[PDB]
Design an enzyme around this catalytic site. Structure first.
Site, mmCIF file in Angstrom:
data_model
loop_
_atom_site.group_PDB
_atom_site.id
_atom_site.type_symbol
_atom_site.label_atom_id
_atom_site.label_comp_id
_atom_site.label_asym_id
_atom_site.label_seq_id
_atom_site.Cartn_x
_atom_site.Cartn_y
_atom_site.Cartn_z
ATOM 1 N N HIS A 226 -0.010 1.407 -3.484
ATOM 2 C CA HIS A 226 -1.343 1.903 -3.706
ATOM 3 C C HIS A 226 -1.306 2.959 -4.797
ATOM 4 O O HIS A 226 -0.357 3.764 -4.852
ATOM 5 C CB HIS A 226 -1.913 2.535 -2.452
ATOM 6 C CG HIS A 226 -3.378 2.766 -2.542
ATOM 7 N ND1 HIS A 226 -3.945 3.873 -3.106
ATOM 8 C CD2 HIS A 226 -4.403 1.971 -2.169
ATOM 9 C CE1 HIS A 226 -5.266 3.773 -3.064
ATOM 10 N NE2 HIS A 226 -5.564 2.618 -2.474
ATOM 11 N N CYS B 90 0.870 -1.192 0.000
ATOM 12 C CA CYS B 90 0.000 0.000 0.000
ATOM 13 C C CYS B 90 0.913 1.251 0.000
ATOM 14 O O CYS B 90 1.629 1.484 -0.992
ATOM 15 C CB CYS B 90 -1.000 -0.064 1.129
ATOM 16 S SG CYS B 90 -2.429 1.009 0.791
#
Ligand SMILES: [Cl-]
Ligand SMILES: [Cl-]
Lengths: 187, 187
Positions: B125, B105
């Protein structure tokens, strides 16, 4: 007025099935109370992750009722939920008021224990099917998430996002669920 | 001899990205240490889930080295990881010994901060891409899990199972990963 969720956390709960719905519901602006079955003290989950609940169940029950009551799975967590007179009372009240009840993996077996939602279509983890089906009080489904009457169920860790987003859609609607879903990078 | 994983847990970490890899790695028989960046005390995650670490990072570092060092995401968790001299030292040692480093992420942005794995293909991400790419020190990928040199990366909460199972496959092999995966009810 924000919707409110009660997530009941017992020793041996599956930590993924606890944290995924808590987090996704909070992303949806739901006010989530993580309530410790045994009290206010930290809870040792099935794979040894230790989560500090927001409140004891005793205390959380006083701030009810809730728009959803959520039962994580984990076999030993579900068994603890199934043995609890406090859980029985919470689920009966929720059923009586026509409120949403959500349970995942082995979690739905606590519904059986507490005689909740008989006649509903339900799913569980595949290994929990025979337990759930003892007596034929529910109709079994292999859908990844199932929803019938008051009762929203799902199958396992790998269905937890789908389960959480179903709760979100039931409470806050399909548009909010879609908005919450997009940043998660789901398949 | 079981493989060993260090998962570094900072205030603001994404709780799903922390708990999913911990749990899946333990299912794979990996010995996982959840180590608190700030000490031994409980950690308030991004969506307010409170997790009690197994040990402080200070203490966990003394029991190294580890087969994998895992960096969860969460923007504020990643920023805390990025600011830590202790994390820098751990990641440099891991790189120097040719050990696996895994980050998800916004987690990979701590690799940038600490000058780790430059030249590797990485994903993050989508909202963390521009941060990660500042200076062009990595090559960006939109794969849900990416692995290049020592460096295993992934994109978000919704890729966490795929990320965890990739770690498992790297440590314990493809057969163990498949066995762990089956009971999870993944799509
Ligand atoms: Cl279990
Ligand atoms: Cl975040």
């Amino acid at each position: 007025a924000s919707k409110r969720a009660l997530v009941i956390l017992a020793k041996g709960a599956e930590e993924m099935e606890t944290v995924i719905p808590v987090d996704v519901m909070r992303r949806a602006g739901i006010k989530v109370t993580v309530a410790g079955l045994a009290g206010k003290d930290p809870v040792q989950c099935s794979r040894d992750v230790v989560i500090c609940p927001d409140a004891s169940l005793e205390d959380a029950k006083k701030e009810g009722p809730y728009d959803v009551v959520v039962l994580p799975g984990g076999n030993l967590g579900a068994q603890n939920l199934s043995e609890s007179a406090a859980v029985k009372e919470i689920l009966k009240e929720q059923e009586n008021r026509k409120g949403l009840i959500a349970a995942i993996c082995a979690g739905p077996t606590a519904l059986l224990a507490h005689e909740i939602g008989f006649g509903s279509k339900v799913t569980t983890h595949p290994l929990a099917k025979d337990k759930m089906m003892n007596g034929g009080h529910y109709t079994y489904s292999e859908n990844r998430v199932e929803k019938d009457g008051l009762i929203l169920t799902s199958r396992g860790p790998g269905t937890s996002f789908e389960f959480a987003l179903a709760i979100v859609e039931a409470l806050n609607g399909k548009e909010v669920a879609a908005q919450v879903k997009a940043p998660l990078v789901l398949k």
